Design a protein around this ligand. Structure first.
Ligand SMILES: [Ca+2]
Ligand SMILES: [Ca+2]
Ligand SMILES: [Zn+2]
Ligand SMILES: [Zn+2]
Ligand SMILES: [Zn+2]
Ligand SMILES: [Zn+2]
Ligand SMILES: [Zn+2]
Lengths: 512, 131
RNA sequence: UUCUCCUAAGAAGCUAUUAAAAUCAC
RNA sequence: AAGUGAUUUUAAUAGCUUCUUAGGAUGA
């Protein structure tokens, strides 16, 4: 071959080009070529009336320059940057009249379910410079894509849709990350669409700020971070990954549709971006928690984790001291960290798999309801952050509700969601069928700490001898309110707690 | 299909200048990290004994000069981007360029660095004997 | 008779180019 | 009048190796 497809002439004119107004050795017409070196005959006048179309198809970004960072990143750092995955799929049309042999981006779909319909504009060559103008276009023939019949007939100029691309992106990623990792599937005529709104250069800094630079403006030459990007046009320095190169087979809709059962559409370009993201989320984080890739602190991480630990240390101690369980089972704790060391139960390690330590004799099993329905009949089983389809009748379950959306709970695969808080937990879909054997837990607080000597609080939920008496003590009021704060903060975070059927809050009273 | 006009060697350097806010530094910072120079530039079998001048509408050259196709040395036009001048009109497109024959291999480079002088019509500092 | 070399012919392969069936991808 | 790339098969052609055949000449 030794000839590429980039900048291929899409012109429907037979002739070639003069010595001047000709880009390369191949764009010169065949007439002048004597001894592989053109010569300007006096006769043939160079054109003054021509417009001609240039094929921006088939870029290639495979450099390594001393100052500029890489567009295409690895899966290792792509997995570390999961807060910045935005699907991207385009759907263009074929150049039809007075041009042929290329495609023009028409519909732009992003993972956030916002299409964009853009008038077909390609780069066109003139006897003075290059231009950016309309082109005659016809929707491709097919019964796969038919909804494209009136979509072309309406269209927004490309300058208005560039504002919406930043208007959209700057809304989502404003307080999630500081970069954008575009997940593509075809890698080809997606780079062609990125030509219309991308710019790269050396690492700058947001004027009127202190952050990284991630947004371009060609009106005022200034580059902005996300929170300060109002009125700017182009996108700065993006990163992009291609999913097909992870060893996938054949076309797209099939290989996503082995896992999920929801994602689908007619052929909308938005519904293409959702599947492409759902593929990498499954492929990467659905069958492990690495424990080795830490994550930055976005907000409330420390407090949420502390509240979760406090309530976990609380409820299990309450349950054991209430029901006098002989044996306590535990599932899913990677290492052996005893939540309540001051207990009498034997804490056997019904862990999923051995995690980097054999010191405390952690044993190995996987749990399924149909397999282990009659295996564990003694004591109670601690399913903290477990992923089993159904829990047994004697259990303390704390499952993350996936229907709550926040900056912590990213959307995931198969209805399940990715909870990224100092670690990546891919909890599956939250269904009521998993808790047929369980019930909800009421709110309460039980401490054995002796009372020592402000607004009075009268709540029967708290169980202390002081509040059992007529006057509540300042050695328990603040503890009660702080526990209430932790509990409400964690329920707002999204965890849901479940207790066995025979749980009785009155059984705690007679212990005193 | 559609007629093609580029070699696989120029794929990487044309892609770099396409996405570039500063196309001037971008190419200069490619050659800086020893990237190979842009290739397949149009060339002219000039009679090579003629009036030496910076840019000419007619093919001309000296012993020390080498004549090139105009639209090929504009890195902007070669990369199909906007021209940072006013009138939005490339000046190179329309004439023949006469490079000094020492740096004759990378012609797109030279125009990025030195310009024409308007007192004699030669590239200033390379024979523009306005001592 | 043997050796080398050259000319041509026939064979197989390699890479290079040109044109064609079908497959995979968008 | 005719979109894009990749892998494919064969045919046509060129370059080169080896092998075989024939010819020429050198030397024993
Ligand atoms: Ca795609
Ligand atoms: Ca698609
Ligand atoms: Zn800022
Ligand atoms: Zn899915
Ligand atoms: Zn007290
Ligand atoms: Zn120009
Ligand atoms: Zn001078």
């Amino acid at each position: 071959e030794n000839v590429t497809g980039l900048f291929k002439d899409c012109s429907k004119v037979i002739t070639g080009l003069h010595p001047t107004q000709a880009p390369t050795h191949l764009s010169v017409d065949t007439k002048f070529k004597t001894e592989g070196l053109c010569v300007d005959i006096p006769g043939i006048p160079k054109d003054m009336t021509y417009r001609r179309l240039i094929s921006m198809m088939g870029f290639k970004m495979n450099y390594q320059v001393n100052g500029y960072p890489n567009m295409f990143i690895t899966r290792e750092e792509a997995i570390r940057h999961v807060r910045a995955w935005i699907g991207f799929d385009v759907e263009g049309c074929h150049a039809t009249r007075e041009a042929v042999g290329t495609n023009l981006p028409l519909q732009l779909g992003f993972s956030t379910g916002v299409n964009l319909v853009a008038v077909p504009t390609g780069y066109v060559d003139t006897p003075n410079n290059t231009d950016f103008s309309r082109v005659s276009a016809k929707p491709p023939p097919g019964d796969q894509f038919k909804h494209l019949i009136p979509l072309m007939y309406k269209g927004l100029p490309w300058n208005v849709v560039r504002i919406k691309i930043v208007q959209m992106l700057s809304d989502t990623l404003k307080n999630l990350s500081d970069r954008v990792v575009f997940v593509l599937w075809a890698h080809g005529f997606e780079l062609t669409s990125m030509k219309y709104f991308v710019k790269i250069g050396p690492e700058r800094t947001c004027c009127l700020c202190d952050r990284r630079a991630t947004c371009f403006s060609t009106a005022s030459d200034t580059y902005a971070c996300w929170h300060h990007s109002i009125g700017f046009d182009y996108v700065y320095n993006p990163f992009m990954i291609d999913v097909q190169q992870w060893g996938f087979t054949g076309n797209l809709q099939s290989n996503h549709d082995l896992y999920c059962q929801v994602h689908g559409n007619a052929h909308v370009a938005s519904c293409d971006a959702i599947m492409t993201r759902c593929l990498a989320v499954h492929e990467c984080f659905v069958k492990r928690v690495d424990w080795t890739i830490e994550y930055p602190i976005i907000g409330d991480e420390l407090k949420i984790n502390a509240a979760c630990r406090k309530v976990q240390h609380m409820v299990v101690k309450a349950a054991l001291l209430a029901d006098k369980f002989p044996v306590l089972h535990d599932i899913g704790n990677p290492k052996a960290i005893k939540c309540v060391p001051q207990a009498d139960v034997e804490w056997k390690f019904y862990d999923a798999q051995p995690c980097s330590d054999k010191a405390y004799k952690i044993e190995e099993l996987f749990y399924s309801y149909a397999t282990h329905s009659d295996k564990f009949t003694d004591g109670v089983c601690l399913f903290w952050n477990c992923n089993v389809d159904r829990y047994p009748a004697n259990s303390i379950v704390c499952r993350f509700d996936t229907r709550v959306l926040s900056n912590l709970n990213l959307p995931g695969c198969d209805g399940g969601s990715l909870y990224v808080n100092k670690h990546a937990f891919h909890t599956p879909a939250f269904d009521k069928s998993a808790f047929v054997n369980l019930k909800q837990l009421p709110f309460f607080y039980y401490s054995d700490s002796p009372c020592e000597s402000y607004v009075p609080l009268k709540s029967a939920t708290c169980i202390t001898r002081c509040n059992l008496g007529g006057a509540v003590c300042r050695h328990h009021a603040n503890e009660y309110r702080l526990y209430l704060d932790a509990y409400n903060m964690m329920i707002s975070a999204g965890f849901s707690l479940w207790v066995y059927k025979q749980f009785d809050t009155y059984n705690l009273w007679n212990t005193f | 299909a559609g007629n093609a006009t580029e070699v696989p060697a120029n794929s990487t350097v044309l892609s770099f200048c396409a996405f570039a806010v500063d196309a001037a530094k971008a190419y200069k910072d490619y050659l800086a990290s020893g990237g190979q120079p842009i290739t397949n530039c149009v060339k002219m079998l000039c009679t090579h004994t003629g009036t030496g001048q910076a840019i000419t509408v007619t093919p001309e050259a000296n012993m020390d000069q080498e004549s090139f196709g105009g639209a090929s040395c504009c890195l902007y036009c070669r990369c199909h981007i906007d021209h940072p001048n006013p009138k939005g009109f490339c000046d190179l497109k329309g004439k023949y360029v006469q490079i000094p024959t020492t740096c004759a291999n990378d012609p797109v480079g030279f125009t990025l660095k030195n310009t024409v002088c308007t007192v004699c019509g030669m590239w200033k500092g390379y024979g523009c004997s306005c001592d």
